[PDB]
């Protein structure tokens, strides 16, 4: 079976060096050119680069050429992507992948027929941070209402957020993560619940970020006059 | 550069149902060079289609593509669940190699207006000097609503920002935050939030609002 096996998750401060590596198995290395592809948080597929392995001259997409370089080890069957200094704009999906051509010398490439599982890289300026539970809480309001938890101002992603220890799950909403100006992160969760419960039902969120090893349980109630 | 643009950006479909998606050339690509991709949230993509209609290896029967001049069509015969994803179009003929914006296919089911809720900051969010305003609109379809935040009746633009949930597994519905950020001395100096939804399925746009310090 043919395999490309990215390297794991980075987090980085702009100004960082960083090489991401792709190992492959299940081929000959030489044989195949390997291309490098970018996506952005919620955006679409861009074409970096390609590398044949071994006669390591790389080709650039005009646009990312001179701040990230394309390599190959044919020893250990490793491709590379490196940047020198690492911007925020460089926050983003990175995958490699073989391309497929003609058999025939005619230098043709058809596309990409085997992926990596890809890279995430984050660039950020802030440091390892738990977050700030802010309620959502209910108006004063067919008899729906909806409360729920600010997680605002971590680092770096994720975070999970259960409701009443995690016996609430109907209607629950834990929106993705945006990452703010500030570098920091912010998302919300809520919770369509009857507006009858409010008041006599405990609801507690149940917020875990696990890099700063912070657990916080966040009573949500109707804001009282 | 090769600009590829697909259309539609979305299509929303059934299961059972045929997908027509195009990827458009800005000058002649020739067939040998287009291939066609599907990606999954959380996965890396998958070759579909080479050569603008030759399947790759282990591509189910129900994809195929064909060309016409510039116009380059994968064809999905007979939706399956697992075909609900984005798919984008790739040239490899001229450097540097160009990819679609892509095409989301989305599961189709009848109009539902969003439920409308606003959340003023909490107080122990005050005292660090920032104030977030939050809009919930829940459980809607389709995805296309306009959220506008109004201050004191005045029309707010570049400090609010969207997040929207993957279409729910049981009722196929889309969800959305908008979070309005203000300093706690500009969200001292007014009285009247609102949120303000358009969406297909609300007769009228409905405004969900409070006053900064009633109850």
């Known amino acids: 079976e043919v395999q490309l096996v990215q390297s794991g998750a980075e987090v980085k401060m702009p100004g960082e060096s960083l090489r991401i590596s792709c190992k492959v198995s299940?081929?000959?290395?030489?044989?195949?050119?390997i291309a490098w592809v970018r996506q952005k948080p919620g955006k679409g597929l861009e074409w970096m680069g390609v590398?044949?392995?071994?006669?390591?001259?790389?080709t650039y997409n005009p646009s990312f050429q001179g701040h990230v370089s394309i390599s190959a080890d044919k020893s250990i069957n490793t491709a590379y992507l490196q940047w020198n200094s690492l911007k925020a704009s460089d926050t983003a999906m990175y995958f490699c992948?073989?391309?497929?051509?003609?058999?025939?010398?005619?230098?043709?490439?058809?596309?990409?027929?085997?992926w990596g599982q890809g890279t995430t890289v984050t660039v950020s300026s802030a440091s390892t941070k738990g977050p700030s539970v802010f309620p959502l809480a209910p108006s004063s309001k067919g008899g729906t209402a909806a409360l729920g938890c600010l997680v605002k101002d971590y680092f770096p992603e994720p975070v999970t957020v259960s409701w009443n220890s995690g016996a609430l799950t109907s209607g629950v909403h834990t929106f993705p993560a945006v990452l703010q100006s500030s570098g920091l992160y912010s998302l919300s969760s809520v919770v369509t619940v009857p507006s009858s419960s409010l008041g006599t039902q405990t609801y507690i969120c149940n917020v875990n970020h696990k890099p700063s090893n912070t657990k916080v349980d966040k009573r949500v109630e109707p804001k009282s006059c | 550069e090769i600009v590829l643009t697909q259309s539609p950006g979305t299509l929303s479909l059934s299961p059972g149902e045929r997908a027509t998606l195009s990827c458009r050339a800005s000058?002649?690509?020739?067939?040998?060079?287009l291939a066609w991709y599907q990606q999954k949230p959380g996965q890396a993509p998958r070759l579909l289609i080479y050569?603008?209609?030759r399947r790759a290896a282990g591509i189910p029967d129900r994809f195929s593509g064909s060309e016409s001049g510039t116009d380059f069509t994968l064809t999905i015969s007979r939706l399956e669940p697992e075909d609900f994803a984005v798919y984008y179009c790739?040239?490899?003929?001229?450097?540097?190699?160009?990819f679609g914006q892509g095409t989301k296919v989305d599961i189709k089911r009848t109009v539902a207006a969003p439920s409308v809720f606003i959340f003023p900051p909490s107080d122990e969010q005050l005292k660090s000097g920032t104030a977030s305003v939050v809009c919930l609109l829940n459980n809607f379809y389709p995805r296309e609503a306009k959220v506008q935040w109004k201050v004191d009746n005045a029309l707010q633009s570049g400090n609010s920002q969207e997040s929207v949930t993957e279409q729910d597994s049981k009722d196929s519905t889309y969800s959305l935050s908008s979070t309005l950020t203000l300093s706690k001395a500009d969200y001292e100096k007014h009285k009247v939030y609102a949120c303000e939804v358009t969406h297909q399925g609300l007769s009228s746009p409905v405004t969900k609002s409070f006053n900064r310090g009633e109850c």
């Open positions: 992948a073989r391309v497929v051509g003609d058999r025939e010398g005619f230098g043709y490439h058809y596309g990409l027929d085997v």
């Open positions: 299940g081929y000959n290395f030489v044989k195949f050119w």
């Open positions: 590398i044949h392995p071994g006669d390591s001259d790389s």
């Open positions: 000058q002649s690509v020739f067939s040998t060079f």
């Open positions: 050569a603008a209609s």
């Open positions: 790739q040239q490899s003929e001229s450097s540097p190699w160009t």
